[PDB]
């Protein structure tokens, strides 16, 4: 039925709207989503976009499914230590994962392999199985230690995508900036998108 | 007269509006500016914000002065390879410099000391004189080599400041995101500002 | 405001609680405003080494310390473990000076690697990225290689690693003289006038 | 329509024949090409194989179209700083690029992310977007610094393919050596080829 | 011989002279034989911090310390700055255990880089090459990056870097309790039974 | 009572002229100096400028005091093992130090933390206390090991300022070269100077 | 008598022609050669150029002597583990050695000092005695690990000369490409050559 | 009847009188010079020493020829992309090259192998052919990135010779400082000179 499974982690960086719009576009492209959200991520979603994701995985899954009028099974949320989840094992996990937005703290944890929660274990799995991990980092300025951590991940095939949208297409609202970034994630995932033209400059 | 001199370099990355908004605020704050603009810079300023900066330094100074209604000598623009500029010698150059927006290619030339034009020499000088260089890099995703370049400069005390505006202050307009970044540049320069509040997270 | 400056002070679970308590006292006497963070291992060490039970709840702690030091109104605010709605948590708002004292090798390690897992680690990461001044008063001996790798990294990046190794070359009558050696060094580095450690050097 | 788009950049290293043959094979394989040529590249093409690429991009597109009897829009040449080309942006650029032949100076510029012209930007974009870049470097001997540069690009997923043809197959004429290299580039690009058989050693 | 083992003990010009004096006392009580090296900056610190004037001449120093500690015959021998005809100077002859205490960052640096410019540095270089145990009780704060680079190098190569950062989690009534914390740690690392620092850990 | 205290060490590199003139300017700028001089530096001073610094510290202080017509307490010299000097401890030492001229050997001692004499300890101190250390290194050519040493210091915030005078100003005389280096030192110290003009290139 | 002694090692990389031509030129330049051939080298010589080097060292010396019409003692072949050869000891070995052609596996063994056979020992001896070793490597594309290995040898004064002939001179036949490489090796060895002219680019 | 060929590059660092005195001595020692001058190097010679080198290469050869009363073919100036020059190919280039004065931007370009112009290609070729490159760097203070660039090249056998003259030989005039540096260059190149004597320290 679905076109593929993608793991999506939302962490406590600023940039909630990116994550909300990415999920909208993935659902519309008819992907199945396994969604992980950190406790700080929930705080940011509430403050920035007024979105309150219930803390219980079941209620969260139903909440998101209604928000996006998604199909049966299309969205599943897994809790912070739910090791039964498919994402926890290289024997079962999807091969694509996006962290959006991705805090420098979560980026750091994945860089060093702390694997202390489901989001960090999932990322560690995608890296070991040689899949695709994309981290949409939101911070500025960067410190040298942020850069060392990004460098290490990028050398190992992780895609560091800072939330730094461009303005060279006609930018007429905040949405168009949001769609710049989301369209780049989607191009990287190998998913047809029409939210960001291919005109170039 | 003025609270100080700042060197501003505009290069060909997207995010012209940041640079225009930065000039606007430094003028109102009564700083004197030495502005440098690469060719690709002007092309970006043109297509993104409809601002055709003349490529002659003298006409460029008058245009910007007029555009910002600046005082006499408050803005001086210098040419691609105009070595008499005060920015080209450690004996004379200002100690604060911002490259906004900063292409990955200019970041790279600065990283490695290419010093091939006035912008690159000007940055090399601030670095050797132990001044403050701030580079507003606008590119995504980063490649590994981007990240090696950035890490090398950052270790050497250059502030890598990617154009990654935050959204926690409540954004209703693109101008709030522009002001997010410009306000961070101003904080770093030690310039009082009220375009981005000090509330933090509420 | 109404104060000379703002300082962020984090207490973590290394031995050396008496250095932290003396440092707060001197900073208050100097009329600085303090944002205090304290980890739970931190409170355990305070409790066992100097008998000071800081309430775990941030309002109650602010009051407790305020009364302890007879501090002015809003001079001391404690913030809790994940209280992100705290000015220390954002570069838009935070103090440019922070001291971790005593700093456990675990907190130093989490700062070194950027873990930013609680308010203490985030506040440090912010100070680092904003190019402020972070001082870490590490208390541990011996060092391992990995401790040294972590301290080295931080020191290359402009973080001041100040082990709690007091000197004895001044008048040492009491333990208080050694506490004051280290607190005197922190104050000098913070740019704060102090008379607890004379400037005579070696005689 | 076409089987895919490829970016080709010709630079000022010896080995113009490799490039001309590579174009011939991609045209016959029904690929669409975006061709970039450096000024040194043009001088090399001229002196080595008598091929004079018009200075004008439109004139060059037609000249090559005509030379290879290529279909409509199958060959588009772009100029030195034509930032409006598809190749300059990650939102638009092809995911495969070859630099044939590749001078050590252009390999250097790409290694360090200098991105000063369309070739180096095109490269940097391919690298950041995680596509495939192949560099047919021609120089001998190598210096340590050449090797450092190749090393870092290689670690970053760029294919350093020196123009070092082998002789273990049927070597009669120079064309067999040219075809050795071109066939290796075609195998890497994933394109069906029979100018170099798969017998291996015999 | 007639002793439990041989230990090389070097005193250098860092603050912390009272750690060295207490360490000799415990080693003597434990019936170890000591080869003592003392630098001239070392004697200056001993003199100013604890009032102990070790004669610069090796015979006179051996007698002075022997009497100070009421040591047995040949239990303490001091050796002078370039006294190469000393068993510490050759791998064919030297003790396999050495402590520098207090260890200045200058002596740590000369050992790190292999300078071997006097008997102290040579004796350390020997212990290192013979795969023995070298403990360095560094006293300095803050650390610089270059200090940390030097300590890191040494620690990777199996040298124990033991900063003089005493803990407070045990019963601390006096300064002597903090001196005994560090001396207790040196003894534990040397494999020497000691009761000056209890083994109760944290309560 | 002076504008501040600076530590200045004179070591056995050629360039005694630069040291003598820095001292002149710092005295006229009303700074208090603590001077250290190596026995090799004393030999260089005697042979190059015929200045004979006496060996005893008290006689040294008086000699330099006399020579510069300095005020009371303005110049104090300290001997090579004079650990009572305020420069020996982070609890008491000035936050600015210059080694002029600086031999490759003393730069090496400082690079590696040898801290063998007062000059080396004073530098070690300034570094660990995060002050400002400036090393006017005179040597040519550099070896690789000299460069490794300077790179290590520079990465750690020490200013490696080779005695490499420029000629773009009005160079009528040797003093013009001495003043180029001295002026650059004083700018780094944050001390107003007018011996080297602040227009750059002309 | 002879102008000097050179060690030549042939290994199992493609490019046997380069080696045969190199020998021809050194013989005509009156050098004395100590030749080593690996078993893979022999297989390559056979399949590429029909040259069957006798398995026996004495038979190989005569076979080559005869092939090049060389003088008495001008060519001595030595076997795989003939440690009694001059080439195996630093007390005796020639100070110039070429490995032509050089497989990436023998370049690897030399990079890491494996010294398992006469070729690798000969190499290691040349390197330790600070003579000149040249490695004509033939492989494409390069892997990262190939590049790491070449890098470390290059940093250590070994000449990595890939078999990447250029085409800027008069290219008519394959012999002109062979002569390009051989002439570069002869220039490095310091030996007068006219198979590759010095006109440079025209 | 020239003793040898030297490539001499003049770049945009201060110290033009070094380069002019170096050509004088090399012409008196009967060496043949191939001189390259960048556009920033012209500007420096014009302003510092009042020498205006014509922009076209033939007029510039004639100009310098007359200036030093050089012999027929003793001096040839080559333009910034005159790739037909002997210096641009390893097959033909001189084995000794001096960059004097050397900017930090030209030192960087050579460090990372940019090879963007004839000066940078010439250097890249001297390095790959294992000749001798000497870089007379004039800048102070150095930044960490300057030091990283120098270190890399020195590790690779390039001689980093900063323009840091000594004073231990009795210094009459500025000329004695110029002659200190030029004598060191000449000593490095292996050319007898009597402008800086050999008595060392007295
Ligand atoms: C409103 C808000 C916005 C934040 N924005 C960022 C940010 O943009 N970047 C960042 O690195 N941390 C940010 N933080 C801090 C992280 O939330 C903090 O480091 C937390 O420990 C992250 O936890 P997580 O990585 O488990 O999500 C923010 C916090 C809040 C409350
Ligand atoms: C509309 C437009 C937008 C561009 N945006 C970027 C950008 O966001 N980041 C970047 O690194 N380069 C960007 N480029 C490419 C640079 O302009 C190009 O690499 C050029 O060589 C920069 O030179 P400069 O650094 O001298 O300005 C852009 C070009 C155009 C035409
Ligand atoms: C009484 C006591 C003393 C401690 N002393 C130290 C110490 O001196 N150094 C250290 O690194 N950790 C010490 N610890 C361990 C830390 O408390 C432990 O590593 C903890 O996880 C640190 O957490 P924190 O960094 O969040 O405060 C001590 C613990 C206790 C209970
Ligand atoms: C006829 C000719 C042949 C050349 N061959 C080579 C070569 O094989 N390798 C190389 O690295 N450079 C070679 N060059 C030099 C490059 O052309 C030079 O470094 C130039 O600056 C490269 O510019 P580009 O990288 O923009 O093409 C050659 C030059 C000419 C004129
Ligand atoms: C009273 C006094 C206390 C000192 N304290 C220290 C210290 O605690 N740490 C340090 O590295 N050096 C200290 N020094 C400096 C060393 O004595 C100085 O670096 C000396 O050269 C060390 O020589 P040594 O390593 O040969 O003993 C002190 C000096 C004096 C006079
Ligand atoms: C006349 C003279 C000039 C010297 N010039 C230099 C110099 O320019 N650079 C240098 O590194 N060493 C120079 N030296 C050598 C240093 O003096 C020597 O290495 C000494 O050991 C350094 O001692 P110091 O670092 O304690 O002062 C010179 C020596 C003499 C006698
Ligand atoms: C016909 C033929 C051609 C070969 N060409 C190459 C080559 O060009 N490059 C290479 O690295 N190995 C090549 N090999 C593989 C090497 O022969 C192989 O790695 C062998 O183990 C090398 O042994 P040697 O290094 O002792 O000569 C070739 C093998 C054969 C049979
Ligand atoms: C009068 C004058 C003096 C200069 N001196 C120096 C210098 O001493 N060192 C330096 O690195 N750059 C110096 N520059 C800057 C270089 O000329 C500049 O970075 C230029 O881009 C170098 O280009 P080139 O390397 O192609 O010659 C100077 C410029 C002028 C106008």
Residue numbers in the entry:
A (entry chain C): 4 to 204
B (entry chain E), D (entry chain F), F (entry chain D), G (entry chain F), H (entry chain A): 4 to 205
C (entry chain B), E (entry chain B): 3 to 205
Publication passage describing the model:
In prokaryotic organisms, several ubi gene clusters encoding a set of enzymes (UbiA, UbiB, UbiC, UbiD, UbiE, UbiF, UbiG, UbiH, and UbiX) produce ubiquinone from its precursor, chorismate.
FMN-bound CpsUbiX crystallized in the orthorhombic space group (C2221) with 6 monomers in the asymmetric unit, while FMN-free CpsUbiX crystallized in the cubic space group (P23) with one molecule in the asymmetric unit. Electron density for FMN could be seen clearly in the subunit interface region of the complex crystal structure. FMN is bound to a positively charged groove in the subunit interface formed by three neighboring protomers. The FMN-binding site is surrounded by the α2 and α6 helices and the C-terminal loop region from another subunits. The phosphoribityl group of FMN is buried deeply in the groove, whereas the isoalloxazine ring remains partially accessible to the solvent. The C-terminal residue, Tyr204, forms a stacking interaction with FMN. In addition, the hydrophobic residues, Val47, Ile46, Trp86, and Tyr171 delimit the hydrophobic part of the isoalloxazine moiety of FMN. The phosphate group of FMN forms three hydrogen bonds with Ser41, Ser106, and Thr109. In contrast to FMN-free CpsUbiX, the FMN-bound CpsUbiX possesses a sharp turn at Ile198, causing the C-terminal end to point toward the interface between neighboring monomers, where FMN is bound. The charged surface is more prominent in FMN-bound CpsUbiX.
